[PDB]
UniProtKB/Swiss-Prot annotation, chain B:
Physiological role: Trifunctional protein with both thiamine biosynthetic and degradative activity. Within the thiamine biosynthesis pathway, catalyzes the phosphorylation of hydroxymethylpyrimidine (HMP) to hydroxymethylpyrimidine phosphate (HMP-P), as well as of HMP-P to HMP-PP. Also has thiaminase II activity and degrades thiamine using water as the nucleophile, resulting only in the formation of HMP (4-amino-2-methyl-5-hydroxymethylpyrimidine) and Thz (4-methyl-5-thiazole ethanol).
Keyword Aminoacyl-tRNA synthetase recorded: no
Chain positions recorded as 4-amino-5-hydroxymethyl-2-methylpyrimidine binding sites: Q63
Name assigned to this protein: Hydroxymethylpyrimidine/phosphomethylpyrimidine kinase THI20
Organism: Saccharomyces cerevisiae (strain ATCC 204508 / S288c) (Baker's yeast)
Length: 519, 521
C-alpha cells in the first residue's frame, strides 16, 4: 500500500532571519568542470561564506587537475546579455573576476563606465600564462578594481620585468610599482617562500600575512577561491584587511584539511571548500520534532587505544614525561613548577565551561550532577592555587592572578577542548577527557616510589594526589565508560575516537614540556 | 610602515575530516546566471550539502527570475570533452541532470552504455522540445534511479492531460510513468489548512511514500526543482537510502523557501530565488572570535518590563499568564488525569531545561555568572523530585523506570526544539532570552492566583499553586530580572529585536504547552 511522512518546519533559530538580505557576489570567470578552480570554485566559496552567487562564464573549458583539455571562449554577444540582465534585475555588492577574454573585457569595461559611481566593488584576480591581454586588464579593468591579487609570476608579467626574492622589501617595491601602473590602490601579492603582502595605497600601509607551510600537491584553485572569499567578505561589509585575512585563512584551512575526490590516476588535487558545512540530513533525522521515522529509513577499549600505532608515541611521551621524573626527585626548579600551576590556574575557568557541556551531554541526570560538582569546586580550586602562590611562592600584589599570560601549549590545549565540546558529540568529548584522567594516574603509578621529595611539600602533595587508591578508582570508572561507548558508537567512526585520544596525549605532553622549558 | 599578522590554524575538530572522501555529484545542466536555478543552484545545493560539485554545461543561457533572455546550446564536442575528461580523472558517485539538449542526450547516452553497470547513480530532473521529451524517455530515463517531474511535466511525458481528483490519480500516473520511462523510482510533485504533497513511488517494492509538506504563501519558488534533484543526488552520493534522500531533499527545499532571501531589485516582485545558504555559518564570525586569533585589526530602566510590554510579546505574554489551565488548577475544576499529563510532560521538559541551563553556563562571560546557572539547575532538579513525589503519592506510580519511558507530546517537542536550536546556533544572551519566559510567567501566573486558590488545603493542586507564588521562587524571579539586564549590557543594541522575537515565540510555546495539558484526552 502506502505510507505518509510529515515534512518538518525549519530550525527555529534559522527562522529569525527570514527574507535575509544576503550579500551578492557576481563571478565573471572561466569554467573548471572538475570543480577545483574557475567559476564553480567561485560559487562554492561564495556559498561557503553564506553569500549569494551569480555567474558570467567567459570561456567554456574542459579542465581537470591533471591538465587543461580544451578552451572555448564564449561569444561576446552571449557574455554581453548575461552581464546586462543580471545587473538589470539583481542586487550586486561585489564583482569578482577570474579568466577574462578580450570580448569579456570589452563587455565589462563598457558596463563599468555605464555604472560610474553606482558600480559595485571589484576584486580582480589575474589568470594568465596560457600579450595584449595583460595590457587590457591593466588599461581597461584594473583601474576600477578595489583590489588585485596576483602571485609573483603574475607580477612579473604585469610589469614586464623579472625582479628578486631577497627579502620583504623586494615584494614591497613590486607592490608599489603595481599600484602605479594599474591605477589600483590596494594590492595583495602571494608568495609561499608562506607569505602574503597587502599594500594599502591611500594610507601607504603594508600588512604582512604569515601563513602555514602545508606540504601538499592539492593546491588547485587556491587563487580563484581566495579572490572569491575576499569578495564575499567585502560584500558582507567587512573592511579590506578583515576580508583579506578572512580569505587567506579560509583557503589555508580548505588546503590544510583537503579532500580525496580524484581518481588515483591523477595523483595535484582540489581543496576542501566545504570543511565547515554541516550535513543537513544529520540534523533533520536527529531533530526533536522528526515525526516520524516509521517509514524512513575484544576486549577492553582502553588497552586497545593505548596500543594503537596512532596514539602509542604520544601516550608514551605522556605517561613517561621528564616533568614527572624531575618532580619526583626534586630536580625540577621552583619556578618551573610555579609556571605549571600558574598556567593550570589560567585554564580553570575554561575548564569549568567544558564540564558544563559535559554535564549537558551526559546520558543521565546522575552523571550531570557529577559534572556540576566538578564545576562547583573550581572556585575553591582557583583559591587553593592562589594560596599556594602566596604562601609557597611570590605574592606580589593581589592583582597578580589577573595578569597571568596564556602560553602556546595552554592556548592550543584550550582551543582543542573548546572545539570538541562545542562541535562534537558526547562520546567524542569523553574520548578527549579520558587521557587527562588516565594519563596522570599511570604516569605517577610508575613513579611509586621512587618519591624523593620531602613529605609535606607541594612536590610530594602533587605526586601522592594522582597515586592514591581513590584516583585509581576514578580511573576504573573512566576505563568502564570507554568500554560502554563501544556498544553505543558505530565502528565506522571508531578511528576519529582514536585520533582525538592521540591528539589530547600530544597536547598534554606539550603542556608539560612547556613547563620544563620555562626561562 | 608594516605590520605582521599571523594566520590561524584550522579549528581542531574540523581537521578530523582531513582528506575527506567527499561525496561527488556531477550536474549536467544549463546555466541560470542570476544564480537562482540551473547549474549554479545545483552547485549551491551540492556545496550546502557538504558534497563535491562538478559541472557539465549543456546550454549557456541568459536568465533572471524575470524571464529567459537567450538560449545558447553548447557544441556537442564541448559536452563530450567535458563529460569524457571529468569521468576519466574524477571520482563520481552520482550524476544529476537538468536542462538537456539533443546533443547532450546523445553524448550522455553513449557514456552510460560504455560505462555499463559500473556507472554512477542517475537522478533525472525533467526540464520541459518536441523530440526532447521522447529522447529523455527512451535514451536517458531507463538508466535513472529516480525521475522527479511536476504534474504538468508528467502530462508532457506520457502525452495526455489527466484530471487529478484525489490520490489514486497521482498513484496511477506514477505507475504509468515507470512503465514507459523504464524507471522504477518516481517522485511526482505538486499536489494541491493547506499542504504541499509529493509522492515517491518505489517501483521494485510496489510501495508509495507520501510526503506532506507545509504550504508557504510566497512567489519566491524559482529553481526549486533544480535544488531538489541536486539535494537528492547529494544525499544518495553520501550513501543514504532513497527515502531518506527524498525526505532530506524536500525538507531542504521547503526550508530554503520558508526562510527565503531578499536578493533581487525592487523592479523584480512576484518572482525570486530561494535561500540555499540558510544553514551556512559565516567563517569570519568564528575566525575573529577564535581564542588563538592572535591579532586585533536604550530602554528606560529594567529590560524585563520593556519585554513584557512590547507589542510583539504582549499578546503571547497575556495568553500565557492568564491561561485557563492555571485558573482550573486553582479552582479545582481541572480533571486529575489532565494534571497528571502536565506533571509527566513537565518532568520530561525539565530534563531538557536542566541540560540547556548547563550550556547557558558554559557560554556565560564570567565564573560568577556560571555558578548562578548551577543554582537554577539545582532548582530545576528540586522540582523534578516534587513531580517524582506527586506521581507516587497522588497518582500511584510504582514502576522504577516510568520516568524514563514517558512519551513526549507535540507541544513539548517544539519547546525543547526551540531552545536546543538556540543553544547550538545562537550566543549566550540569545540562549538566556529563550529560557527566561518559563521562569517569569510561572511566578506571575500564580501570583495572580493568591489568594483566590479554592483548591482544598493540602491537595496537589493547592500545593502546586503555592510553590510558584512563594517568596523563594520570587527570589529566583528577582535573579531572572537582574540577569535580563546583565545581558542587555553586553548585547549589540541594533540586534535587540532578535532578543524580543525569541522571548515572544517562547511565550507562544508556553501557552501551547498549557493548552496541550488542558485539552488532553
Amino acid at each position: 500500500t502506502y505510507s505518509t511522512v510529515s515534512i518538518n518546519t525549519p530550525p527555529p533559530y534559522l527562522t529569525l532571519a527570514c527574507n535575509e538580505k544576503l550579500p551578492t557576489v557576481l563571478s565573471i570567470a572561466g569554467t573548471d568542470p572538475s570543480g577545483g578552480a574557475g567559476i564553480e570554485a567561485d560559487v562554492k566559496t561564495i556559498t561557503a561564506h553564506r553569500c549569494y552567487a551569480m555567474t558570467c562564464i567567459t570561456a567554456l573549458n574542459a579542465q581537470t587537475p591533471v591538465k587543461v583539455y580544451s578552451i572555448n571562449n564564449t561569444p561576446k554577444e552571449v557574455v554581453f546579455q548575461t552581464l546586462e540582465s543580471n545587473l538589470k534585475d539583481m542586487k550586486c555588492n561585489v564583482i569578482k573576476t577570474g579568466m577574462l577574454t578580450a570580448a569579456a573585457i570589452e563587455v565589462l569595461h563598457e558596463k563599468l563606465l555605464q555604472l560610474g559611481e553606482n558600480r559595485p566593488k571589484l576584486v580582480v584576480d589575474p589568470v594568465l600564462v596560457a600579450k595584449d591581454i595583460v595590457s587590457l586588464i591593466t588599461e581597461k579593468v584594473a583601474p576600477f578594481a578595489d583590489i588585485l591579487t596576483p602571485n609573483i609570476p603574475e607580477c612579473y608579467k604585469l610589469l614586464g620585468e623579472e625582479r628578486k626574492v631577497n627579502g620583504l622589501q623586494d615584494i614591497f617595491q613590486i607592490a608599489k610599482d603595481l599600484a602605479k601602473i594599474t591605477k589600483c590602490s590596494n594590492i595583495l601579492v602571494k608568495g609561499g617562500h608562506i607569505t602574503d603582502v597587502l599594500f594599502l595605497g591611500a594610507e601607504q600601509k603594508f600588512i604582512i600575512f604569515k601563513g602555514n607551510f602545508v606540504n601538499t600537491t592539492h593546491t588547485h584553485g587556491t587563487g580563484c577561491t581566495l579572490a572569491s572569499a575576499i569578495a564575499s567578505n567585502l560584500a558582507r561589509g567587512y573592511s579590506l584587511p578583515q576580508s583579506v585575512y578572512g580569505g587567506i585563512e579560509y583557503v589555508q584551512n580548505a588546503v590544510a584539511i583537503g579532500c580525496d575526490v580524484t581518481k588515483e590516476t591523477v595523483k595535484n588535487g582540489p581543496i576542501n571548500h566545504v570543511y565547515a558545512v554541516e550535513i543537513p540530513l544529520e540534523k533533520m533525522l536527529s531533530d526533536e520534532c522528526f515525526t516520524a521515522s516509521d517509514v524512513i529509513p575484544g576486549g577492553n577499549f582502553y588497552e586497545y587505544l593505548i596500543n594503537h600505532p596512532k596514539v602509542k608515541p604520544h601516550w608514551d611521551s605522556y605517561i613517561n614525561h621528564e616533568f614527572v621524573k624531575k618532580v619526583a626527585d626534586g630536580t625540577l626548579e621552583r619556578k618551573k613548577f610555579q609556571f605549571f600551576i600558574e598556567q593550570d590556574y589560567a585554564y580553570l575557568v575554561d575548564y569549568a565551561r567544558v564540564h558544563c557541556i559535559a554535564g549537558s551531554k551526559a546520558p543521565c541526570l546522575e552523571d550531570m550532577e557529577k559534572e556540576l560538582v566538578i564545576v562547583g569546586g573550581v572556585r575553591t580550586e582557583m583559591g587553593q592555587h592562589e594560596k599556594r602562590l602566596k604562601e609557597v611562592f611570590g605574592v606580589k600584589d593581589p592583582d597578580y592572578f589577573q595578569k597571568i599570560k596564556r602560553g602556546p601549549a595552554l592556548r592550543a590545549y584550550s582551543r582543542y577542548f573548546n572545539d570538541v565540546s562545542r562541535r562534537g558529540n558526547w562520546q567524542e568529548l569523553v574520548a578527549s577527557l579520558t587521557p587527562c584522567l588516565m594519563g596522570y594516574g599511570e604516569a605517577l603509578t610508575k613513579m611509586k616510589g621512587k618519591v624523593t621529595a620531602p613529605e609535606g611539600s607541594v612536590y610530594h602533595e602533587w605526586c601522592e594526589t594522582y597515586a592514591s587508591s581513590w584516583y585509581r578508582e576514578a580511573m576504573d570508572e573512566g576505563e568502564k565508560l570507554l568500554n560502554h561507548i563501544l556498544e553505543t558508537y558505530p565502528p565506522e567512526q571508531l578511528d576519529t575516537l582514536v585520533t582525538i585520544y592521540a591528539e589530547v596525549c600530544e597536547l598534554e605532553t606539550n603542556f608539560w614540556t612547556a613547563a620544563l622549558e620555562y626561562e
